[PDB]
């Protein structure tokens, strides 16, 4: 007899199509507040428009709130990076935005030495066996 034990498929973002990881970016600023001056300038300066033109798969919200200025960004996986751009200037804000866009939403994490690849595919060659070795031990 053969019985099936249930399972589900794992998504590999880039193998078929590629969904773009960043989805929404919210430029948050304040009219009053010297910390939010750079942000304001950025908003003014057609740079935002240019960015929009470049990257239409990602939407730019523009909120008005009383605190420090922010760039909260929302990703496919669900997670949300948030960068407070306190007291930055236009270029720095732009750089921050770029950084946000580039990243996948995934959490930061310490890598060990040489941990490069991350597969969910069973080894093409088998896992070594002492009995199926080409050279026996002694």
């Amino acid at each position: 007899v053969v019985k099936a034990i249930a399972r589900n498929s794992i998504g590999r973002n880039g193998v078929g199509a590629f969904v773009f990881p960043c989805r929404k970016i919210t430029l948050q600023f304040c009219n009053w507040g010297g910390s939010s001056e750079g942000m304001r300038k950025f908003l003014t300066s057609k740079r935002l428009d240019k960015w929009g033109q470049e990257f239409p798969w990602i939407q730019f919200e523009v909120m008005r709130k009383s605190g420090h200025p922010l760039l909260r960004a929302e990703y496919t996986n669900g997670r949300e990076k948030v960068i407070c751009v306190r007291n930055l200037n236009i270029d720095n804000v732009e750089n921050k935005l770029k950084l946000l866009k580039d990243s996948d939403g995934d959490i930061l994490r310490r890598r060990t030495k040489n941990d490069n690849v991350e597969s969910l595919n069973s080894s093409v060659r088998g896992i070594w066996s002492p009995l199926h070795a080409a050279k026996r031990h002694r």
């Binding site: 069973s122 093409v124 060659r125 088998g126 896992i127 070594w128 066996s129 009995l131 199926h132 070795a133 080409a134 050279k135 031990h137």
Partner: protein
């Protein structure tokens, strides 16, 4: 066939003393071309095409003609393991219908006197076959069940756990 050079997964370092060291392998480099590297590994969980036997490929698949599910071991030498007596000496269909009926009747009548083993002995036939043929009186079965239950009850804590573990292991070992 293919006339490729064959190689071990080589290390520039001493394999006996330092096989786990990745760096050595990395350092090693071999002359450009094709190579035959037999997998240093069993093919139990695998579904690789170079693992499937020729008999299970369709009569059309080009891989049939090629030579990479190698028959390294030879069946002459390997001892039969946990095999039934019918396999060593072919199956027999000697037993008729009347005989079968008689056997069934016997089973119905007295299971403790005419147990499966006894039946087998009588009719030169497997206990399994007997079982297949004939159901014993349900009372007997019930009694057996009760006995089993009692035995289980008599177990200590540790033993039960062990049994459970064993069961789990068994379950696992049909996954592959």
């Amino acid at each position: 066939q293919f006339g490729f050079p064959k190689t071990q997964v080589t290390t520039i370092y001493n394999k006996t003393k330092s096989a786990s060291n990745y760096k050595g392998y990395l350092k090693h480099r071999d002359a450009p071309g094709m190579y035959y590297q037999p997998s240093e590994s069993i093919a139990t969980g695998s579904v690789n095409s170079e693992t499937i036997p020729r008999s299970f490929m369709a009569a059309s698949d080009p891989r049939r003609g090629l030579d990479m599910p190698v028959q390294s071991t030879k069946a002459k030498q390997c001892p039969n393991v946990l095999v039934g007596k019918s396999t060593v000496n072919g199956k027999t269909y000697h037993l008729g219908p009347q005989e079968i009926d008689e056997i069934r009747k016997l089973r119905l009548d007295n299971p403790q006197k005419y147990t499966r083993k006894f039946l087998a002995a009588k009719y030169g036939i497997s206990p399994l076959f007997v079982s297949m043929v004939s159901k014993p009186s349900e009372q007997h079965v019930q009694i057996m069940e009760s006995r089993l239950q009692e035995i289980q009850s008599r177990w200590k804590e540790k033993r039960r756990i062990a049994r459970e573990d064993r069961k789990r292991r068994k379950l696992l070992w049909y996954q592959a």
